[PDB]
UniProtKB/Swiss-Prot annotation, chains A, C:
The modification 2,3-didehydrotyrosine is found at residue 60. One of its GO terms (biological process) is bioluminescence. Gene3D superfamilies: Green fluorescent protein. It holds the Pfam family GFP. Homotetramer. Contains a chromophore consisting of modified amino acid residues. The chromophore is formed by autocatalytic backbone condensation between Xaa-N and Gly-(N+2), and oxidation of Tyr-(N+1) to didehydrotyrosine. In addition, the residue N lysine undergoes cyclization. Maturation of the chromophore requires nothing other than molecular oxygen. InterPro entries: GFP (IPR009017), GFP-related (IPR011584). This is GFP-like fluorescent chromoprotein FP538. Pigment protein that is yellow in color. Keywords: Amidation, Chromophore, Luminescence, Photoprotein.
C-alpha cells in the first residue's frame, strides 16, 4: 500500500473536556504490519490536564493492526489518501465523548499525520477522571463490521478503565471508519484485540506521557 | 438584570455532523422575561445540510425563560459576565451529539451573542435525520437541578422529534449550565417547559429557517 | 366509571432483587378523583429487605391521577375490568428492573387489587440501594403518550432518588399501559406530575412502611 | 468436576414477553469440556409465541465452555452445589428483558437441569421480534470479569441478532454469574467466544426449535 514496515507518525489533538480546552501534540514510530505503535504526547496547551489522560488515549490508528491474509485490511487498503474516523465514548458515570480523527499520509516522508478533535462532558467531579484515579485501560476485543452499501466500517467495543483503587470504569466505544476513497474490497465482520498502555513522562516543566498499542485482527474462533 | 424586555441576539454555529462540516449564522429578537424568541437561520457553509435541521435547533438560551419570582433565575442572574452550556444528545437510533454554547451579552448593543459548536455522529443513513423526515420537536418539560458545591446547573429532558409519518423519534438531552462568574445564589430544583418550532424559509440561493421558542419556569404542582 | 370518591386497594408484590426473593402485601385508601393514595406495606417474606425499599415504591396506580375534563382518562375509563402495566427501571449505576402490575377491580367491594412482579439486578453492592442510602424519590413530571393504532399508553419519566448524603440517584422509567378492554376514546399526549413519599413503620417484629402519592394530569403549558 | 464428557440437560422456561405468558420445556446433550451443546425446545404454553424465539436463546449454561488449563473454570468449579445467573437484555429499540436461571446437576442422572424465568417488554410492535424477522445471533466474544470480594462473575457482550433483510439488530447482554457455594478460587478476567444457532422444528401440533452452542474460553492475545 506504500507502507513501510516501520513508520513514523504525528499527533495534534484539539480538545475540551468539561469546559477545559487543551492542546496535545505528539510523535511516534509504528509497525503497520506488526500492529504495534509507540507514541510520545505533550500538553502544549491547557496543561496540566484537570482530568485523567487515559480518556484521550484511543483518540490518538487502525492501520496499526496486524491483519490475517484471509482478512481484508480496510485501513491499509486506505493507502495512500488515508481515512477518517469518528467515535462516541459512553462512560458509565454519565460522561459523554465524541472524537474525530483525520488520518493523512506524508507519503515520501513515510509519516502518518493524525488530526483530532476531542469533546467530552458530564465527567463527574468526583469521578476517577476528574479525580484522576485511573491507571490504564484493560485489554479488549472489538467487533469490526462492514456497512452494506456504504464502504465504511463499524467498530464496537466495551472498554474498561482500570482505577487505582483496583476497580474498573466502564466505557462504550462506538466507531465509524470512513476510507478517503471508494473501497474495492470490503472485509467481513471480524474482531480486533487491543492492548493500550500509558506511561507518564511529565517533568515538572511539561505534561507528557508515552502511549503504546498492540492489535491483531481475528476471525470468530468458530 | 441589565437585560431588556425586548432584545436581540446573534448566532454563529460551526459543526460537523456525520462528517459533514457546516457553518450557520442567525439573527433574532427575544423576550427574556416572556421567555419567548424567534430566530432566523442561514446556512452559510456546508449547505444544504445533508441531515435534518431539527437536530440543531436546541443547539442555538436559558436567558429566554419566564421565571417566577419565587424561583432563582440562574441564567439572568448570569449577567453581566454571561454563561456557557454543554449538552449531550442521545438519539434512540444510536446517533451521538455534543453541543457547546458560549453566551455573551452586549449592553450597548442590547444583543445576545451565541457561539455554538455542534458535533454529531452515528446518524443512521436511512434514519429520519439522514433522510430528512423530521418535522418538529414535541413540547417538553425539562428538569433543572442545582449541583451542590459546584455553582452549576443540570438540565434533563426526554425529547421527541416528530416525524412526517407522524412517528416520534427519541432523544435524551443532558445539559450542564455554567455561569461565567461565581453565582451569588442558587435556585432550587424546578422544571422548564418548552415549545420549539421550525418554519422553513429557504430559497434557491440560500437555505434558511426560522426558529421559535417559548419557555416557562415552574415548580412542582 | 363505577368509581367511588374514596377507594380501598390491596397489594401483593412478588419479587427478587439481586437474587433476593421477597413478598410484600399491602392495603390502602385512595381518592381516584383527587389523584391521591396512601398505602400500607408489609414484608411477609424475604425481610428484612437487603436493598432500599424505595425501588419498589412505584411498582405498587394511574387511576389515582387527577385528570382535567379536557383530558381523556385512559385509566378510569379502564373501569370496570381494569388494566395492566409493565415498566422498565434503568438506574444510573447499571442496575436493571422490570415491573409488571395487574390491576383488577372488586366492584361491589369497591376495592382495587394490585398484583405485581418485580425483578431487579445489577444493583451495586456499594450502591445506595444495596447500602440502603436512599430516602425518598424527588418530584417528577411524566410524559404520557398514546400509541397510534394500539389502544395503549406510553409513560416516560426520569426519576431521581434522593440519598442520605444529600445526593440524587437517577433512574429512567419507561412504561406501557394496557387497558383490559378496547378503548373508545384515547387521550392526547400529556403530562403527569407526581409526589411519592415513604415513611417507614418497621417495628422490630416486622418491616413495614407507608406510601403516599399525589398526581395531577396536565397539558403542555403552551 | 463430577461432570461427564458427555451429558444431558433439562429445560423448563416461564416467561411473559410483552405481556404474553408462555411455558417452554427442553431436552439436550452436551459436552462440558468441548463447550458444545444441542437442545430441543418445545413451547408447551402460550404457543405459538407472538415474538421471535431468538430473544430466548441465551436464556436457556456456562458449564458448557471449553476452558484452558491456564484459566479458572468458575462454572465447572461450581459443582456440586451448582450456580445461578441473572441477565439483562438491552435491545437497541427500547426493549427490555431480564432472565434468571437456576442451575442444578444430577450425578445419578448425569443431567443438568435449567430453570429459567424470562421477562421482556417494550418490544416495538413493528420490530423484528414482534414481526418475527430475526434469523440468528452473530458469533460473539464476551468479557468475563471477576468481582473482587464478591465471589461472583460479570459477563459483558454486545449482541447482534441477524435479520431476514440481512440487517443486524443490537442487544446488550449484562450478566451476573453466582455460584451456589463459596468459590475456592476465582479466575482472571478473560473472554468467552460463542456461536449459537437456531433451527426451527415446529410441526402443526407443536412449536419446536433446536438450539446449538459452541463456546471457548480465551485470554488476551
Amino acid at each position: 500500500h506504500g507502507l513501510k514496515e516501520e513508520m513514523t507518525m504525528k499527533y495534534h489533538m484539539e480538545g475540551c473536556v468539561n469546559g477545559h480546552k487543551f492542546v496535545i501534540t505528539g510523535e511516534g514510530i509504528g509497525y503497520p504490519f506488526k500492529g504495534k505503535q509507540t507514541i510520545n504526547l505533550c500538553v502544549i496547551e491547557g496543561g496540566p490536564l484537570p482530568f485523567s489522560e487515559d480518556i484521550l488515549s484511543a483518540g490518538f490508528d487502525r492501520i496499526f493492526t496486524e491483519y490475517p491474509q484471509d482478512i481484508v485490511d480496510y485501513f491499509k487498503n486506505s493507502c495512500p489518501a488515508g481515512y477518517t474516523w469518528g467515535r462516541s465514548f459512553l462512560f458509565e458515570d454519565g460522561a459523554v465523548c465524541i472524537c474525530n480523527v483525520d488520518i493523512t499520509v506524508s507519503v515520501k516522508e513515510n509519516c502518518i499525520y493524525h488530526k483530532s478533535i476531542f469533546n467530552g462532558m458530564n465527567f463527574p467531579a468526583d469521578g476517577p477522571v476528574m479525580k484522576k484515579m485511573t491507571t490504564n485501560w484493560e485489554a479488549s476485543c472489538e467487533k469490526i463490521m462492514p456497512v452494506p452499501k456504504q464502504g465504511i466500517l463499524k467498530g464496537d467495543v466495551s472498554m474498561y478503565l482500570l482505577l487505582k483503587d483496583g476497580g474498573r470504569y466502564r466505557c462504550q466505544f462506538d466507531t465509524v471508519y470512513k476510507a478517503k476513497s471508494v473501497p474495492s474490497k470490503m472485509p467481513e465482520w471480524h474482531f480486533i484485540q487491543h492492548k493500550l498502555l500509558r506511561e507518564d513522562r511529565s517533568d515538572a516543566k511539561n505534561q507528557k506521557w508515552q502511549l503504546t498499542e498492540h492489535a491483531i485482527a481475528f476471525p470468530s474462533a468458530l
